[PDB]
Amino acid sequence: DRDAVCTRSVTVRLPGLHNSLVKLKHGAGVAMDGQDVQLPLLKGDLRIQHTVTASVRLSYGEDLQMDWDGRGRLLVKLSPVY
Amino acid sequence: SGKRYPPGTSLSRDCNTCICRNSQWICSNEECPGECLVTGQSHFKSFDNRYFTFSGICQYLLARDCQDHSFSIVIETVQCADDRDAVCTRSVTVRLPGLHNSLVKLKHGAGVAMDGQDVQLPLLKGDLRIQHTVTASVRLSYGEDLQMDWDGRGRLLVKLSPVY
Amino acid sequence: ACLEGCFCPPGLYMDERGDCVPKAQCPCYYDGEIFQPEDIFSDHHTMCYCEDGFMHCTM
Amino acid sequence: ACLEGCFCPPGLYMDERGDCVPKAQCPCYYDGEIFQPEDIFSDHHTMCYCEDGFMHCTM
Structure with a gap:
């Protein structure tokens, strides 16, 4: 169907460390x-x-979380500092 | 080795081949890769097929590229039982100046x-x-001229091609 | 080479979880991404799915 | 929190290979290094072993 658009992957970018680039992969990878x-x-x-x-969790510092982007159920936790 | 072969046959060592002609094996002398081995407690093997043992506990230099500096390997050794004559490997550190001047560490797991x-x-x-x-065992492979083997419980091996 | 160790019969292929499985539910590792055995999957412009361990992309 | 998922009974602790095991053969991860359940292990100056999942070092 054309009305079926799910997530593959999400890219995260931390300028605070190396200006690195994290990629969350459709596995748990x-x-x-x-x-x-x-x-x-x-x-x-x-x-x-x-x-x-069966599910990945990023944790940058204390003011950030993530959740598994394997089959595309991405979540975040932004503390009130933001 | 105490057994006969007809003439013309070509038996082959791991290194090269040899052919029977007039009761005299003819052979090439072309080089072939060597292996420094660590295992057991402290039993070492050289590239040149020497055996010995040296129950030293320190960060010793296992091997190194020595005219240029393509790599360098560093064993780290530890006593490994109640006995004083029991010194096994914990970990080995590898260093590739060719990429980032990074530092790889092989860990007593498969880690x-x-x-x-x-x-x-x-x-x-x-x-x-x-x-x-x-x-159940790690294998590094730098380029084509280098291999490694699991340093988990301390059975380190290498493969150095004849370029070195 | 012809190595020595713990294998399982040729009908079974090794899964990540210590079991080995037939190739039906054997996931795909496209871009590394561990796709489940049935994953229909595509941009506007590409079109891709995981059949049996292989990832069939098109355009 | 009090999360939801696949656990195994409290006598059993999770092993890397998808099984979970009692703490007897539960390896140690000292420096990350996956020590087998019985690993006597030491420099000249330190002295260390893996008992039951914990790594007992001394000096």
Whole structure:
């Protein structure tokens, strides 16, 4: 159908660290700067680990969350600082 | 090896071939890749097919490209039992000046860590490929002239092509 | 080479979760992305799906 | 929170291979390194082992 448009992937961009580029992949996969990456991913600020082992969760600092963009159920958590 | 072969036959070593002619095997002398092996507690093998043991506990230099600096490998060794004569490998560090001057670390699991970051397998970067082999053992592959083997419980191997 | 280890019979292919499975539900890894075995999937301009482990894209 | 999903009973803890296991053979992840459940392990100066999922280091 033409009236069926779902999400494939989402790209996140952190100018605060390297001006890197994170990509959330239609699996539970993530790719930083083209590189596929194991979970957990403790870098300084952002933590990327599974939740139920079937869903990814980014956590940049304390003022940001994400949710699995595998089959396209993206969520966010923006604290009131924004 | 105590068994006969007719003339004209061409038995082959892993390195090259040899052919029976007038009771005399003719052979090439063309080079073939060498292997430095670590295993056991502290049992080493050289490229030149030497064996020995050195139960030292420090960050020793296993291997290195020494006329240029394409790479460098660094074992890290640890005592590995109650006995003092039990020194096994924990981890090995690899360093590629050719890409970012990065720093790869092979971890006592099947884990790898690039520059402090844990990483999923496969790891296709431009040159180096790091993927499991049996899903219980890691294999690095820098270009075509280099391999590695799992340093989980400490059975490190290498493959250096004759360019080195 | 002809290596030594834990395989499972040729009808079964290895899944990520330690089981190995027939190729029916064997997902696709297009762009790396782990597509479920039935995933219809397309921009305006491309047209792509995961059949059996292979990802059939078109334009 | 009190989340919803696939767990296994409290005697069993989750292993990497999709099974969950009691804590006896539950490996250690010291420095990330996946130590088998019995791994005696030490420099000259430190002294470390994996007991049950925890890595007991000393000096």
